């Protein structure tokens, strides 16, 4: 059940290739285009592709959001 | 080299511990507000390599530093 | 009152801009050496940038020269302060906010004259801002 969910995360990283500025290589900017996003500046830009742009993870197991259509 | 204005070709990994003692013997007041990071290997070779944190955070960070990085 | 004095205060050192130059980071084993002919080219590039700012923004023509850029505190790391003065009025210092706007207008032109890349030619207090990414 969960072993075929790890393969769906591997397929999401295979679809996100075929581009030379790789999506996990740089931070996005703010609303006001002056600096990077606040949790991409403290952590790594690779952590702001797995936790916020792929998973969109929350702060606990006790609150869950929605179905997150791109991982569906 | 920015707090005491030295040229760049004098301070390197071979004599970093030699010259930081020379800076507190010269200016003991201007050396107090400077910060020095404490880092050494076996602290970077032992980190959070938790589940789903090696193929996505460790490998995808190292691929972006190879040439022809969309191929790898 | 306060009895005694400080040897750090100056009557010009609040309109000065600190410049830091890292030659061996940008080029490395192939970088020129910074003699006083390079300081002459730096003072002419700043005087050129002040001429372009007053012409295109303030609509005035002012003949700034290299003798109107006053350099103090030259170090080996390659760092100094500078401030800009009106062409023959020695008492007229251009404010720091107008020199920052003039350097931002012509920063790409000063970098190309020395082969530096905005991390090897730092104007302390002036930061690069723009550049939104995208294309897909
Ligand atoms: C040189 O610049 C100074 C300002 O730094 C000028 O002094 C001003 O003079 C006018 C009238 O003479 C006064 O109303 C201002 O208050 C003065 N400014 C200051 C800051 O005191 C001076 O006139 C300039 N000299 C020349 C020849 O242009
Ligand atoms: C950033 O820009 C947006 C415009 O989309 C504006 O609503 C917001 O107030 C700005 N934030 C700051 C801190 O100025
Ligand atoms: C997940 O992303 C959506 C938009 O893509 C956003 O509205 C939502 O707040 C995100 N969830 C969390 C927990 O940040
Ligand atoms: C840097 O300068 C110091 C003092 O002049 C000198 O002792 C040292 O050898 C220099 N470092 C070099 C040349 O790598
Ligand atoms: C300078 O700092 C070091 C520790 O970083 C200390 O051992 C040394 O005694 C200090 N020197 C002076 C003159 O305070």
Swiss-Prot record, chain B:
Glycosylation sites: 10, 24
Subcellular location: Cell membrane; Apical cell membrane
Top-rank taxon: Eukaryota
Residues spanning the signal sequence: none
Ranges per topology, Extracellular: 1-69
Known tissue expression: Robust expression in kidney and small intestine, with minimal expression in pancreas. Also expressed in stomach, liver, duodenum, ileocecum, colon and prostate. Not detected in testis, whole brain, cerebellum, fetal liver, spleen, skeletal muscle, uterus, heart or lung.
Disease involvement: Hartnup disorder: Autosomal recessive abnormality of renal and gastrointestinal neutral amino acid transport noted for its clinical variability. First described in 1956, HND is characterized by increases in the urinary and intestinal excretion of neutral amino acids. Individuals with typical Hartnup aminoaciduria may be asymptomatic, some develop a photosensitive pellagra-like rash, attacks of cerebellar ataxia and other neurological or psychiatric features. Hyperglycinuria: A condition characterized by excess of glycine in the urine. In some cases it is associated with renal colic and renal oxalate stones.
Protein role: Transporter that mediates resorption of neutral amino acids across the apical membrane of renal and intestinal epithelial cells. This uptake is sodium-dependent and chloride-independent. Requires CLTRN in kidney or ACE2 in intestine for cell surface expression and amino acid transporter activity.
Family of the protein in this entry: Belongs to the sodium:neurotransmitter symporter (SNF) (TC 2.A.22) family. SLC6A19 subfamily.
Subunit structure: Interacts in a tissue-specific manner with ACE2 in small intestine and with CLTRN in the kidney. Interacts with CLTRN; this interaction is required for trafficking of SLC6A19 to the plasma membrane and for its catalytic activation in kidneys. Interacts with ACE2; this interaction is required for trafficking of SLC6A19 to the plasma membrane and for its catalytic activation in intestine. Interacts with ANPEP; the interaction positively regulates its amino acid transporter activity.
Name of the featured protein: Sodium-dependent neutral amino acid transporter B(0)AT1
Organism: Homo sapiens (Human)
Gene name for this UniProt entry: SLC6A19
Residues of the full protein shown: 345 to 416 of 634
Curated annotation (Swiss-Prot), chain C:
Domain notes: The extracellular region of the ACE2 enzyme is composed of two domains. The first is a zinc metallopeptidase domain (residues 19-611). The second domain is located at the C-terminus (residues 612-740) and is 48% identical to human collectrin.
Top-rank taxon, per record: Eukaryota
Lineage of the species this protein comes from: Eukaryota, Metazoa, Chordata, Craniata, Vertebrata
Tissue expression notes: Expressed in endothelial cells from small and large arteries, and in arterial smooth muscle cells (at protein level). Expressed in enterocytes of the small intestine, Leydig cells and Sertoli cells (at protein level). Expressed in the renal proximal tubule and the small intestine (at protein level). Expressed in heart, kidney, testis, and gastrointestinal system (at protein level). In lung, expressed at low levels in some alveolar type 2 cells, the expression seems to be individual-specific (at protein level). Expressed in nasal epithelial cells (at protein level).
UniProt-recorded name of the protein: Angiotensin-converting enzyme 2
Quaternary data: Homodimer. Interacts with the catalytically active form of TMPRSS2. Interacts with SLC6A19; this interaction is essential for expression and function of SLC6A19 in intestine. Interacts with ITGA5:ITGB1. Interacts (via PDZ-binding motif) with NHERF1 (via PDZ domains); the interaction may enhance ACE2 membrane residence.
Residues with glycosylation annotation: 89
Region described as Essential for cleavage by TMPRSS11D and TMPRSS2: spans on this chain: 96-115
Family classification: Belongs to the peptidase M2 family.
Organism annotation: Homo sapiens (Human)
Localization terms from the record: Cell membrane; Cytoplasm; Cell projection, Cilium; Apical cell membrane
Induction: Up-regulated in failing heart. Expression is induced by IFNA and IFNG. Exposure to cigarette smoke increases expression in lungs. Expression is decreased in nasal and bronchial epithelium of individuals with allergy after allergen challenge. IL13 stimulation decreases expression in nasal and bronchial epithelium. (Microbial infection) In airway epithelial cells, expression is increased upon influenza A virus infection.
Region feature Essential for cleavage by ADAM17, mapped onto this chain: 51-58
Applied biotechnology uses: An engeneered stable, dimeric and secreted receptor with combined mutations that increase the affinity for human coronavirus SARS-CoV-2 spike protein shows potent SARS-CoV and SARS-CoV-2 neutralization in vitro.
PTMs per UniProt: Proteolytic cleavage by ADAM17 generates a secreted form. Also cleaved by serine proteases: TMPRSS2, TMPRSS11D and HPN/TMPRSS1. Phosphorylated.
Every Collectrin-like domain range: 13-136
Residues of the full protein shown: 602 to 737 of 805
Gene from which this protein is expressed: ACE2
């Amino acid at each position: 059940l969960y072993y075929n969910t790890i393969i769906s995360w591997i397929m999401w990283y295979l679809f996100n290739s075929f581009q030379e500025p790789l999506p996990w290589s740089d931070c996005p900017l703010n609303e006001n285009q002056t600096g990077y996003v606040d949790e991409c500046a403290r952590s790594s830009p690779v952590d702001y592709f797995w936790y916020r742009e792929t998973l969109n993870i929350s702060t606990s197991i006790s609150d869950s959001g929605s179905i997150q259509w791109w991982m569906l | 080299i920015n707090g005491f204005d030295l040229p760049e070709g004098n301070v390197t990994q071979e004599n970093f511990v030699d010259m930081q003692q020379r800076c507190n013997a010269s200016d003991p007041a201007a050396y107090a507000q400077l910060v020095f990071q404490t880092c050494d290997i076996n602290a970077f070779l032992s980190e959070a390599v938790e589940g789903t944190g090696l193929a996505f955070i460790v490998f995808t960070e190292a691929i972006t530093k190879m040439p022809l990085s969309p191929l790898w | 009152s306060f009895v005694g004095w400080s040897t750090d205060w100056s009557p010009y050192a609040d309109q000065s801009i600190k410049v830091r130059i890292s030659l061996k980071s940008a080029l490395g084993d192939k970088a020129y050496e910074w003699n006083d002919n390079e300081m002459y080219l730096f003072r002419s590039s700043v005087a050129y940038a002040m001429r372009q700012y007053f012409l295109k923004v303030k609509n005035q023509m002012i003949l700034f020269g290299e003798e109107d850029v006053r350099v103090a505190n030259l170090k080996p790391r390659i760092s100094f302060n500078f401030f800009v003065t009106a062409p023959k009025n020695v008492s007229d210092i251009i404010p720091r906010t107008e020199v920052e706007k003039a350097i931002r207008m012509s920063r790409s032109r000063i970098n190309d004259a020395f082969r530096l890349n905005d991390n090897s030619l730092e104007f302390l207090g002036i930061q690069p801002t723009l550049g939104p990414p995208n294309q897909p």
